[PDB]
């Protein structure tokens, strides 16, 4: 699907950080946080896909994603478990 890390638009990052607590954001923050988000997404999706490969499935389930997130110490509650 070519590239889609640009799908996290600059206003989206701005609103995310603004909810975080910041009040001024430097121009170079956007590329760094896009890289950080891509790294974290790769880390979580690799585990959530190895879980599916184990289950001999072809559809990544919410249970797979929540198990992958739990394995990294970032538990998620609203989606079963």
């Amino acid at each position: 699907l070519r590239d889609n890390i640009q799908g996290i638009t600059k206003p989206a990052i701005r609103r995310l950080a603004r909810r975080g607590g910041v009040k001024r954001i430097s121009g170079l923050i956007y590329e760094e946080t896009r890289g950080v988000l891509k790294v974290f997404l790769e880390n979580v999706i690799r585990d959530a896909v190895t879980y599916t490969e184990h289950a001999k499935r072809k559809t990544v389930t919410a249970m797979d994603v929540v198990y992958a997130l739990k394995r990294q110490g970032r538990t998620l509650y609203g989606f079963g478990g």
């Binding site: 699907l1 070519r2 590239d3 889609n4 890390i5 799908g7 996290i8 638009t9 989206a12 609103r15 995310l16 950080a17 603004r18 909810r19 975080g20 607590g21 910041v22 009040k23 001024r24 954001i25 430097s26 170079l28 923050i29 760094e32 946080t33 950080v36 988000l37 891509k38 974290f40 997404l41 790769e42 979580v44 999706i45 690799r46 959530a48 896909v49 599916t52 490969e53 072809k58 559809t59 990544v60 389930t61 919410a62 797979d64 994603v65 929540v66 997130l69 970032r74 998620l76 609203g78 989606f79």
Partner: protein, 94 residues
């Protein structure tokens, strides 16, 4: 009107709410493109993509509050890539 007094209002109106901040379709395309290089021709449950979005959003919000901590500690209000790098280095993720 002047630079400021609008970022604070945005913080007030965005910390109170809980709606998703990353557009759903671009994030769906992003997770699809990331997962397509591990296993080819995959399918994603809608709840699975939503859970991924709600986890990444929370993680990014936490990282941004930590990087604001770092920026304030350096006698600055503007967060810069050095702040994010230091926050991720201290957190141990690296």
């Amino acid at each position: 009107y002047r630079p400021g007094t609008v970022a604070l209002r945005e913080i007030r109106r965005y910390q109170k709410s809980t709606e998703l901040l990353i557009r759903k379709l671009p994030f769906q395309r992003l997770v699809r493109e990331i997962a397509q290089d591990f296993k080819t021709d995959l399918r994603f449950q809608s709840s699975a993509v939503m859970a991924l979005q709600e986890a990444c959003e929370a993680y990014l919000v936490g990282l941004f509050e930590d990087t604001n901590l770092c920026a304030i500690h350096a006698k600055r209000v503007t967060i810069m890539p050095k702040d994010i790098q230091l926050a991720r280095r201290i957190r141990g993720e690296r």
